[PDB]
Amino acid sequence: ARTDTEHLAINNETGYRSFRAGGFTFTRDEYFARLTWPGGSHIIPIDAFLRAMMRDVAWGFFYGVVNFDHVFGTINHYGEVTMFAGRFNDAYRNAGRDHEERFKSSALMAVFKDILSDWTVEGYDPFAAPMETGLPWGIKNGNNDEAISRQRVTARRMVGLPGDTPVRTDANGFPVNRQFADVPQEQPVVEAEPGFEAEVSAYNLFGYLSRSDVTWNPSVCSVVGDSLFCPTSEEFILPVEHGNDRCEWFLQLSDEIVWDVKDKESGKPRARVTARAGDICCMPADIRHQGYSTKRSMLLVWENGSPKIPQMIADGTAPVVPVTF
Amino acid sequence: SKARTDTEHLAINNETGYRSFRAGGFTFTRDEYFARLTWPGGSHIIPIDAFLRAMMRDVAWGFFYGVVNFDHVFGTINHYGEVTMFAGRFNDAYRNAGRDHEERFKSSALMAVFKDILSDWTVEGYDPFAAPMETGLPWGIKNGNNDEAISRQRVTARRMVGLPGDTPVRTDANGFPVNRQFADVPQEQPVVEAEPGFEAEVSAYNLFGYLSRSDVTWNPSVCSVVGDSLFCPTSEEFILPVEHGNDRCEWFLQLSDEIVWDVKDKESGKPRARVTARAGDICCMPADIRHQGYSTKRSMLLVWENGSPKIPQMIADGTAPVVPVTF
Amino acid sequence: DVVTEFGALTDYRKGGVEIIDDDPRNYVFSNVFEVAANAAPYERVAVGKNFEYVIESARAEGTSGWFSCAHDEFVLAMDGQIEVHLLKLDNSDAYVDPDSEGAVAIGEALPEGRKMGRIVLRRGHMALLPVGAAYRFYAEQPAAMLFQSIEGAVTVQKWGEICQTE
Amino acid sequence: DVVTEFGALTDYRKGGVEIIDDDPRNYVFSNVFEVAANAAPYERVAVGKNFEYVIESARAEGTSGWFSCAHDEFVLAMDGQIEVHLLKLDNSDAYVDPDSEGAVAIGEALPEGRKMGRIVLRRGHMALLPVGAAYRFYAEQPAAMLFQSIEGAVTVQKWGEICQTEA
Ligand SMILES: [Fe+3]
Ligand SMILES: [Fe+3]
Numbered sequence A: 001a002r003t004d005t006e007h008l009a010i011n012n013e014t015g016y017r018s019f020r021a022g023g024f025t026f027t028r029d030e031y032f033a034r035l036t037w038p039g040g041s042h043i044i045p046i047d048a049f050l051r052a053m054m055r056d057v058a059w060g061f062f063y064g065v066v067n068f069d070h071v072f073g074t075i076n077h078y079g080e081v082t083m084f085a086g087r088f089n090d091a092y093r094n095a096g097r098d099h100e101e102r103f104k105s106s107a108l109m110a111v112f113k114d115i116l117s118d119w120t121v122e123g124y125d126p127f128a129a130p131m132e133t134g135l136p137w138g139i140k141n142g143n144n145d146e147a148i149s150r151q152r153v154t155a156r157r158m159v160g161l162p163g164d165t166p167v168r169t170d171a172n173g174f175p176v177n178r179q180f181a182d183v184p185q186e187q188p189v190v191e192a193e194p195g196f197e198a199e200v201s202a203y204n205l206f207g208y209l210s211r212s213d214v215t216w217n218p219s220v221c222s223v224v225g226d227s228l229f230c231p232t233s234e235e236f237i238l239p240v241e242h243g244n245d246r247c248e249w250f251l252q253l254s255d256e257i258v259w260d261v262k263d264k265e266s267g268k269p270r271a272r273v274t275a276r277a278g279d280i281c282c283m284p285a286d287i288r289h290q291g292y293s294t295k296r297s298m299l300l301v302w303e304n305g306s307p308k309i310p311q312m313i314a315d316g317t318a319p320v321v322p323v324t325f
Numbered sequence B: 001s002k003a004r005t006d007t008e009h010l011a012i013n014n015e016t017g018y019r020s021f022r023a024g025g026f027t028f029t030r031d032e033y034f035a036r037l038t039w040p041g042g043s044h045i046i047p048i049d050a051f052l053r054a055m056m057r058d059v060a061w062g063f064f065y066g067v068v069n070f071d072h073v074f075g076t077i078n079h080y081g082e083v084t085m086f087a088g089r090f091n092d093a094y095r096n097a098g099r100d101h102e103e104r105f106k107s108s109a110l111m112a113v114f115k116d117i118l119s120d121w122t123v124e125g126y127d128p129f130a131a132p133m134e135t136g137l138p139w140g141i142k143n144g145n146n147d148e149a150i151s152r153q154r155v156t157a158r159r160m161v162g163l164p165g166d167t168p169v170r171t172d173a174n175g176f177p178v179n180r181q182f183a184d185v186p187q188e189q190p191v192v193e194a195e196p197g198f199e200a201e202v203s204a205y206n207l208f209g210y211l212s213r214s215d216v217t218w219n220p221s222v223c224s225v226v227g228d229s230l231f232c233p234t235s236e237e238f239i240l241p242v243e244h245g246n247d248r249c250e251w252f253l254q255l256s257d258e259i260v261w262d263v264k265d266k267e268s269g270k271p272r273a274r275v276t277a278r279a280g281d282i283c284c285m286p287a288d289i290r291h292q293g294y295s296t297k298r299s300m301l302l303v304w305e306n307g308s309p310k311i312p313q314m315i316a317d318g319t320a321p322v323v324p325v326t327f
Numbered sequence C: 001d002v003v004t005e006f007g008a009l010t011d012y013r014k015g016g017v018e019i020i021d022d023d024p025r026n027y028v029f030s031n032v033f034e035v036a037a038n039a040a041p042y043e044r045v046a047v048g049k050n051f052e053y054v055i056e057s058a059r060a061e062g063t064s065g066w067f068s069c070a071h072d073e074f075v076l077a078m079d080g081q082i083e084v085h086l087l088k089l090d091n092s093d094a095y096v097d098p099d100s101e102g103a104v105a106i107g108e109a110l111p112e113g114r115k116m117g118r119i120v121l122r123r124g125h126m127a128l129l130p131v132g133a134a135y136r137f138y139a140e141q142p143a144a145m146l147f148q149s150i151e152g153a154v155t156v157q158k159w160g161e162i163c164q165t166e
Numbered sequence D: 001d002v003v004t005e006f007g008a009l010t011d012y013r014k015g016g017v018e019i020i021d022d023d024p025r026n027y028v029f030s031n032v033f034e035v036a037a038n039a040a041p042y043e044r045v046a047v048g049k050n051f052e053y054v055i056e057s058a059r060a061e062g063t064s065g066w067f068s069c070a071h072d073e074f075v076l077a078m079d080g081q082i083e084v085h086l087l088k089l090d091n092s093d094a095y096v097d098p099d100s101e102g103a104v105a106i107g108e109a110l111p112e113g114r115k116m117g118r119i120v121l122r123r124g125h126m127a128l129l130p131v132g133a134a135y136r137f138y139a140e141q142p143a144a145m146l147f148q149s150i151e152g153a154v155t156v157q158k159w160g161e162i163c164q165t166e167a
Helices: A046-058 A090-095 A104-117 A205-210 A308-315 B046-062 B090-095 B107-121 B206-211 B312-318 C034-039 D032-038
Strands: A005-008 A019-022 A024-028 A032-037 A040-045 A063-069 A071-075 A079-087 A099-104 A187-191 A201-205 A222-224 A227-237 A241-243 A247-251 A256-263 A269-276 A279-283 A285-305 B007-013 B019-023 B025-032 B034-039 B044-045 B068-069 B075-076 B084-085 B101-106 B191-193 B202-207 B225-226 B229-239 B244-245 B251-254 B259-267 B271-278 B281-285 B291-307 C016-019 C045-051 C054-064 C066-068 C073-079 C082-089 C102-109 C113-121 C125-129 C133-150 D016-021 D042-051 D053-063 D066-068 D073-080 D082-089 D104-107 D114-120 D125-129 D132-148
Touching: A005 A104, A019 A104, A019 D066, A032 A046, A032 A201, A040 A046, A046 A063, A046 A071, A046 A104, A063 C066, A063 C082, A079 A104, A090 B271, A099 A104, A201 A205, A205 A227, A205 A285, A222 C073, A227 B251, A227 C133, A247 A256, A247 A269, A247 C045, A256 B044, A269 A279, A269 A285, A269 B090, A279 C045, A285 C045, B007 B107, B019 B107, B034 B046, B044 B046, B046 B068, B046 B107, B084 B107, B101 B107, B206 B229, B206 B291, B225 B291, B225 D132, B229 D132, B251 B259, B251 B271, B251 D042, B271 B281, B271 B291, B281 D042, B291 D042, C034 C045, C034 C054, C034 C133, C082 C125, C113 C133, D032 D042, D032 D053, D032 D073, D032 D132, D073 D082, D082 D125, D114 D125, D114 D132
Parallel strands: none
Antiparallel strands: A005 A019, A019 A024, A024 A032, A032 A040, A063 A071, A063 A241, A071 A079, A079 A099, A187 C113, A201 C125, A222 A227, A227 A285, A241 A285, A247 A279, A247 A285, A256 A269, A256 A285, A269 C016, B007 B019, B019 B025, B025 B034, B034 B044, B068 B075, B068 B244, B075 B084, B084 B101, B191 D114, B202 D125, B225 B229, B229 B291, B244 B291, B251 B281, B251 B291, B259 B271, B259 B291, B271 D016, C045 C054, C054 C133, C066 C102, C066 C133, C073 C125, C073 C133, C082 C113, C082 C133, D042 D053, D053 D132, D066 D104, D066 D132, D073 D125, D073 D132, D082 D114, D082 D132
């Protein structure tokens, strides 16, 4: 599992640096990310690229396959990470033109962070929805290192408990997003008997989510073993097609999302799932998916973080769908 | 088995402020971010910028030649007087499942509702014919219109640019300044010296100059004609907004800078090739692929077409080859 | 003005799986309000499952019996207003088997322990249900809630009845 | 500051075809400068062909013989100054079969007719070559040009030598 990455030259005309990781090269210009690897090349528009890179960075390579598009992406091996071109593309695979390299995660993550920093310009937030931010086009113009370096929040047990991740408020820097202006913000009534105040705890979860400053960013709010509730607020398009290496579940908390479901291995369209409030569905382990949300919407993403799952699915000792009827 | 003419203006949504439209069994709705398509048995979403840019082309080109794929799902096939609109026709997943849907229209009926959609959905300060760095944004609720941007009169030479009574050369005084990404291109006219009486047949013009003054991107426009041989050059910036599945071979001659072409199988949409063309590179797109171009800097491209109406049938019949030269 | 659309037992609008080449049953799609609307008060119906872990939907209506659990659980109110009472058990081992998972209905009889507190949840409020506490609910008007838990002696599975088969 | 890159006989940078699943010969890929660079003076090498219609690449060098054609043609100068001389033929039928197509080489000697005009083209300049006129070229230094015409008597085909065959 490789470790060799490199900062290459700043381009005189564009102002941007290029980067190498193993055999892959990364270069951007005024409109595009340009990728090369031994045997071929690919172009992704820079806006989509940076939104995808932002999530793959913020999520630490997430679970399973983070497809940036139909050609390029990463596969999390939890400590190591595969980067690929065409691994999950029928055309490339049939032709034997796919390419994959395997890295130590910290090595690939360090280069991905430098890419994101160098390629993000002033006033552009690749974590935000298009109506909330400026543009990534043109030559290097400053940076937005503040937007791309946000601290991950993860509750150890539950939001708002002593020593755990805190409730969001105006005062700690998290106001209500304009598209949730109407969401009630009152906290639940909590009256603890003397000596139990650490154990009697509740918070306004929809209010917390109305205060999220990023889009498409599942964030642990409550834990029971490996079961993680990871809600998030969603707007525009999930910047990746997620092919999970386990099953996962979506519960729509507000408004509406449509999921485009394709085959995980080939990328062929399989289904479109419309979820309105209250709808819960499963994404099976052999598909990839990408969501669309016109209005900023609240979603619960529910995960089983157990590391045993991917090998069980591979073996067939765990099913691709968790329930059959 | 007649071609359809049923199209309809549906309601204005009172939140977004946009009208939705019907054409046969398809309906067209946009919101703040998306064009929402429906047909009998199916639905599809396309980000509204990609959608308006592709629509601007189909409308501008009068459905062009063969297949204008807006994306991997949705598009039109020109039949020259009639036009098929589709979802999934050129998508193996849809076709293998029998979930593709096609409806054939009378060309002017479909065109008139495409124009209505294009007009209603295009907001003030948004030019769907320009590159992203040249124009505003389409997001959010209806806010005015850009009817002049979406109404540009096509220019076509009958014989050549500049001939008497033919399409004129572009100049600042006729409202065509040089584009900022062509700022260094030389603008002199060639020397033309006609003997008395032959002034209508001694003619020449600065083609690269005329292109450097194009006010729109990805818009092949006829500059010179010999029978069915059409020279259609244009200035390209960003991404060609459609994937073109031509019903004939066509040639690309790169005049300036560089374009890369994403080459896919026309029927399945599978990637087959990527073609990088720099200044002086000329190549052909086979009839059996679809292609989409990427130009970082605004570039000059010649699109060379054979406009003969007899070719599509011959290719379909197998009488004419899918590659125009063999070796 | 911005309108954020929330569901309620009395006002929900189910979506679904549109198929290109698939089986809708693979997405195991239900609407937790519809599920709560149709169950017995405080009946805990599985609406998601991933190995042993579950999400349960239930309608709160009147006063429940007491529950306790060998691990933590969380409850999220989805609609209406729901009162939670917490009791610290003197001997929770007398009610819950240490080796067990999932909530346990431990009876209507008040178990022996000390009052921990009380919580009033409305739509969107999540409370902790801590290991070692017994808890019970009251809701004046019918309300919906979900549980993050483990499949156990209280969990009802009825996938054929709640899910899209299209 | 903006630089628009044009090619030249002495400075071009050829691209090509990367294959995922295909044959590069399907794309008939050549560079018009390389083609004109390697050709004899005024040799008209087909670089595009669609049925009977061609695009020909030629290197102008010195004075060409005269040409005439039964239909309009066009010439685009790609690099270097090229002078075009036009003559209205008295009897075009005496030099070119009004039923043939493609340029015909009608000799070095001045055909019979009236001086029509003179055109001087530089890079990027296109001229009409009108039916019924004979035309000749003059180029002091090697210059690249392209013709819009029809396959005929002067059209050289050498696809195997000009286009990409491997990837
Ligand atoms: Fe996912
Ligand atoms: Fe084309």
